[PDB]
Design a protein around this ligand. Structure first.
Ligand SMILES: [Zn+2]
Ligand SMILES: [Zn+2]
Lengths: 197, 197
């Protein structure tokens, strides 16, 4: 099966050499879920344009080293002019909390996934009094995916590296939601030099 | 900007829906560098097939919560049968250490990127005598890209979730190196049921 992968890669690479010879300086940092159904390509860019941080449920803890390190590198060293936090509908991590199945993770040897999803569960609990007005699971799941984009966006825009670059007119931050059913991006939040602060 | 991004996404989504409407569960966890020049699409397989953890210099600390959570979700919940750790040549984080410019990061308000890159710099220092015979930065950078694949691979295969699945013959782990000059994957390491670590 590795030989299948190497074969698939060689085919892909020969085609890629022909199509984009200049590929063989990004302007955007894309932060998205590890979910297999999308990546930075949903932005309608070519390779080389988008530097990507992809993690389970696109979680951006404010005091996390990887977040701070990634924002510093993208903004100060690579000099991206866009940071995009892009969640998506039908997110596994969110569903696991929404359907109260996080409790069951330690039983099946997923104690670290359990701990990792703490932030998502905390959001889900905070949101109980808003969820109750939505009738179907589809609606609740959509709401929490949207809500998670706001949640992580608000932490990114408090980051001092981000505030400095934005204030200087060198950076804009967008919070987007990818709809898996149609491939469309939807605007959740924006933070630019001119947005009210 | 955002207007351009939404238009490019809309156009992209239409082009995807016209070719493959049926695109709207993965077999592979891909772990790669945040680098803009490659992602899971280098494997040459269908979209929705590869769940992806993408971080700066593809660092996998054994005790990192994200590593454990990501492996537990992929192997136990998604039941992927392949874990791929895929580094690449011309890696910025490696070149920062190799060329001794990591020490410059605190001055430019990147002290967290500085701390994040400790593992890469430790590898660089550990390998310094091994690097003497290589007279060009290109050769050194290649050596260190390869070394880093094995370094992160070695930690992944010691994770209990990974070891259980591999010993059960339900998982294979591949260490790969993506050459940015030609789009081709080099095999660095493999771990299977019948292969020693
Ligand atoms: Zn998700
Ligand atoms: Zn890299």
């Amino acid at each position: 099966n590795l030989q299948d992968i190497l074969a698939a890669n060689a085919k892909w690479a020969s085609q890629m050499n022909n199509i984009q010879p200049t590929l063989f300086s990004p302007h955007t940092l894309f932060i998205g879920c590890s979910d297999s159904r999308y990546n930075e390509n949903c932005l309608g860019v070519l390779p080389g344009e988008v530097f990507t941080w992809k993690n389970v449920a696109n979680i951006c803890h404010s005091e996390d080293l990887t977040l701070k390190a990634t924002l510093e590198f993208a903004i100060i060293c690579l000099k991206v002019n866009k940071v995009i936090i892009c969640g998506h509908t039908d997110c596994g991590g969110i569903k696991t909390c929404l359907t109260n199945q996080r409790e069951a993770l330690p039983k099946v040897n997923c104690s670290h996934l359990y701990k990792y999803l703490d932030d998502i569960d905390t959001m889900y609990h905070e949101e109980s009094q808003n969820l109750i007005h939505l009738k179907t699971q589809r609606e609740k799941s959509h709401y929490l995916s949207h809500c998670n984009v706001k949640r992580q966006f608000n932490r990114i825009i408090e980051n001092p590296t981000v505030q400095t670059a934005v204030q200087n007119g060198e950076l804009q931050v967008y919070g987007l939601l990818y709809n898996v059913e149609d491939g469309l991006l939807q605007t959740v939040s924006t933070y630019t030099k001119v947005t009210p602060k």
